[PDB]
Nucleic acid binder design. Structure first.
Length: 91
DNA sequence: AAAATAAAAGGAAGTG
DNA sequence: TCACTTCCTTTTATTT
């Protein structure tokens, strides 16, 4: 099955939800969410997983802080900002 | 100088 | 044991 960061990385390289998520530094691997239109992206992710309840950002973001330990995606000290690890993008 | 509102944080139990 | 998911609470940041 699909992991969350791959669902995000795909949208970014897709332009699928440019309104809800966009690159901040495609180089450095930084991305950001829209404060207004983020809940719509969270809803889709939950829909692609088949969860028992509809997905919110608060819960999706919870799954993001777990990546902190494994290294895939680290939080950035800026509103609604995260960063992919080099291993996820390339070299 | 406060509120109000949103973001971040993280323990713990639940789910296939 | 993954990979989140759900819930709850508290702290921190921003915006109003």
């Amino acid at each position: 099955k699909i992991r969350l960061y791959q669902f995000l990385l795909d949208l970014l390289r897709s332009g699928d939800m440019k309104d809800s998520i966009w690159w901040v530094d495609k180089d450095k691997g930084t991305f950001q969410f829209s404060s207004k239109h983020k809940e719509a992206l969270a809803h889709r992710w939950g829909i692609q997983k088949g969860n028992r309840k509809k997905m919110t950002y608060q819960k999706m973001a919870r799954a993001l802080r777990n990546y902190g330990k494994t290294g895939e995606v680290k939080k950035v000290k800026k509103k609604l900002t995260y960063q992919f690890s080099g291993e996820v993008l390339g070299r």
